[PDB]
Amino acid sequence: DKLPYPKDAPRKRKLGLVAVPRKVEEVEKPTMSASGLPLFVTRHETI
Amino acid sequence: SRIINVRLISMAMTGYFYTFTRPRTSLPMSMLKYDPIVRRKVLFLEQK
Amino acid sequence: GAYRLKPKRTIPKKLGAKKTGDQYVIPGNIIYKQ
Amino acid sequence: SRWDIEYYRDPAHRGYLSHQLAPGESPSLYFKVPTGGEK
Amino acid sequence: RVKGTGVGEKVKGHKHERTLVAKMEKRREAMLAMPDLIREWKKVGKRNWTKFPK
Amino acid sequence: VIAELIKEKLAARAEYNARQSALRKLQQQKMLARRGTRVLRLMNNYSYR
Amino acid sequence: LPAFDPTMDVKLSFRGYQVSPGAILDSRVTEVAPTLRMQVFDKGERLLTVVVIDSDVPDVTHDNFKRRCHFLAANIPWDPSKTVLSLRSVGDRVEGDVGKPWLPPFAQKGSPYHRLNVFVLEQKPGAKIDGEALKKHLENRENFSLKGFREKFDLEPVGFNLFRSEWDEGTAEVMERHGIPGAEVEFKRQKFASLKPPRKARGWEAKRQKPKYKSLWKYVKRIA
Ligand SMILES: [Mg+2]
C-alpha cells in the first residue's frame, strides 16, 4: 500500500477478532454454603 | 517550608486517603474523589 | 572542563527513528522519538 | 487451638467434631449466624 | 480446660473481629449521610467550608 | 368562556401536582426500604458482614 | 460513497419514538421496520429507492468486515407534499417493489457497534426498476456494495440517516424469533504477543538463581 490514501477510497481496516463459542450462564448459585450455613442473610428495618 | 503535604481523608469513614501538596498560605483542600473501598465517588476533606 | 573542573556528561536520549519504512510493527511499538 | 477446632467442627470438611454442632449452629467458636427479618 | 477452647471457656476473638460490626456500622452511617453532606459542600462552597475532620 | 379555560388550566396543574406528589411518596418509600436493607454475606472465617 | 451531500431530510422512527442520528438502539426496539419522515425541497413527483445497509458485519474467515443489506425497495413515488413513509407498507399500501423485507439488525457479542446506514436514492425520470431485476441483484450477493448498486441502476443518493446497534440482553432472543444464525459466537480481541525471542536473564542476582549458589540464596531470593 502507498500512503496517503486517496480521500475518496474506502477505509482499509482489519477485523482483529477471533471467533469463540459464547458462554451461556447458569442460574444455579446455591443459597447455603458447603458448611450448611446461609450464604447471605437479609435484614430490613422498620419505622 | 513554603509547601506542605496534606492528607485528604474519605468522608465515607473507610480509611482511604489522598495526598497532595499546596502552599501554606492557602485554604485547606476539599475535593470529590473516588473511594476504591466503597467503589464510589465521595467527599474527601483535609485531615487537620 | 576548564580551569575549574565541571563534569558535564549527560545520559544519551537516543532520539530519532526506531523503525524504518516498510518495517513490520505491532501495536505499541515506538516508531520515532522526537 | 481455635483454628484447628473450627476446622474439624464443620461438616464441609467432614470433620469428626461436626456431630457436636446443631443444624443451625456455626463451626466458628466466636462468630454466629445472624438472623434475618424485620426487627 | 485451657483458656478459650476449654470446657465452659469462650473464645475472645481478635481485635479486628470484635470491632467488625461496629466498623461496618460506622461506614454505613457515613454513606447514608453522604448525599446531604455533598449538598452542603456544593452549596456552601469549597472555599467557605470549615467542617474539616480532625 | 375564559373562566372555563382557566379552570382547565388550573385542573391540569392541580392534577399534575396530585400525581406528582403521589409519585414522590412512592419514591421516598422505595428509598426508605433500600437504605434500610442490610445484606450480611459469608465472607471468611465464618464471619458475616 | 466517495462523496455525499444530502439534499433532503430523512427522520426515522421506531414504534413512534424518534431516534437521533447515530444513536445506539436496543435490538428489541429495532426488530420492526422503522417509519421514515422525509421531505424533498424540489418540485414534482419522483421515484425513490430506500436501502438499509449494515457496514460492520465481521467476517472472521478473512479477518475483515463485509456489508449486508437489511432492507431494499424501489419505485416509491414521492412529492414535496408527502411526509410519512412506513417501510412495512411498501408493498400493499404504498406503491413500491420490495426487493428485501426488513431484517432485524443484530450484532454478535464482542464485536464493535454496527452502523445501519439508511440511504434514500432518487431514480431518474421515467426509470422504473424491474421487480425481478431488483430481487436478482441480491440472489448471490453476500457483500452488498452501494457503489455498485448505484451505478448499475443509475441512482442518485439524496437522503440519509443513521443508527447503531450492538449486543444487548435482547439480541439472543431476537435471533431466535427470526431464525438468524450466529448468536452462539463470541468475538475476542486478537492478541499480538511480543516479537522478541527469549533471552537469558542478566545481573548478579539473576545468574545465581540455581541450586549451585545455594549458600548465596540469602541475596537472590524473596527480593522485593
Ligand atoms: Mg555541580
UniProtKB/Swiss-Prot annotation, chain A:
It comes from the Eukaryota. It is found in: Mitochondrion. Component of the mitochondrial large ribosomal subunit (mt-LSU). Mature N.crassa 74S mitochondrial ribosomes consist of a small (37S) and a large (54S) subunit. The 37S small subunit contains a 16S ribosomal RNA (16S mt-rRNA) and 32 different proteins. The 54S large subunit contains a 23S rRNA (23S mt-rRNA) and 42 different proteins. Component of the mitochondrial ribosome (mitoribosome), a dedicated translation machinery responsible for the synthesis of mitochondrial genome-encoded proteins, including at least some of the essential transmembrane subunits of the mitochondrial respiratory chain. The mitoribosomes are attached to the mitochondrial inner membrane and translation products are cotranslationally integrated into the membrane. Belongs to the bacterial ribosomal protein bL27 family. This is Large ribosomal subunit protein bL27m. It comes from Neurospora crassa (strain ATCC 24698 / 74-OR23-1A / CBS 708.71 / DSM 1257 / FGSC 987). The chain holds residues 150 to 196 of 447 of the full protein.
From Swiss-Prot, chain B:
GO terms for cellular component: mitochondrion; ribonucleoprotein complex; ribosome. Its main location: mitochondrion. It is found in: Mitochondrion. One of its GO terms (biological process) is translation. Keywords: Mitochondrion, Ribonucleoprotein, Ribosomal protein. The keyword Mitochondrion applies. GO terms for molecular function: structural constituent of ribosome. Component of the mitochondrial ribosome (mitoribosome), a dedicated translation machinery responsible for the synthesis of mitochondrial genome-encoded proteins, including at least some of the essential transmembrane subunits of the mitochondrial respiratory chain. The mitoribosomes are attached to the mitochondrial inner membrane and translation products are cotranslationally integrated into the membrane. Component of the mitochondrial large ribosomal subunit (mt-LSU). Mature N.crassa 74S mitochondrial ribosomes consist of a small (37S) and a large (54S) subunit. The 37S small subunit contains a 16S ribosomal RNA (16S mt-rRNA) and 32 different proteins. The 54S large subunit contains a 23S rRNA (23S mt-rRNA) and 42 different proteins. bL33m stabilizes the tRNA acceptor stem in the E-site. Belongs to the bacterial ribosomal protein bL33 family. This is Large ribosomal subunit protein bL33m. It comes from Neurospora crassa (strain ATCC 24698 / 74-OR23-1A / CBS 708.71 / DSM 1257 / FGSC 987). The gene is mrpl39.
Swiss-Prot record, chain G:
Component of the mitochondrial large ribosomal subunit (mt-LSU). Mature N.crassa 74S mitochondrial ribosomes consist of a small (37S) and a large (54S) subunit. The 37S small subunit contains a 16S ribosomal RNA (16S mt-rRNA) and 32 different proteins. The 54S large subunit contains a 23S rRNA (23S mt-rRNA) and 42 different proteins. The lineage of its organism: Eukaryota, Fungi, Dikarya, Ascomycota, Pezizomycotina. It is found in: Mitochondrion. This is Large ribosomal subunit protein mL38. Belongs to the phosphatidylethanolamine-binding protein family. Mitochondrion-specific ribosomal protein mL38 subfamily. It comes from the Eukaryota. Component of the mitochondrial ribosome (mitoribosome), a dedicated translation machinery responsible for the synthesis of mitochondrial genome-encoded proteins, including at least some of the essential transmembrane subunits of the mitochondrial respiratory chain. The mitoribosomes are attached to the mitochondrial inner membrane and translation products are cotranslationally integrated into the membrane. The chain holds residues 226 to 449 of 449 of the full protein. Disulfide bonds: none annotated.
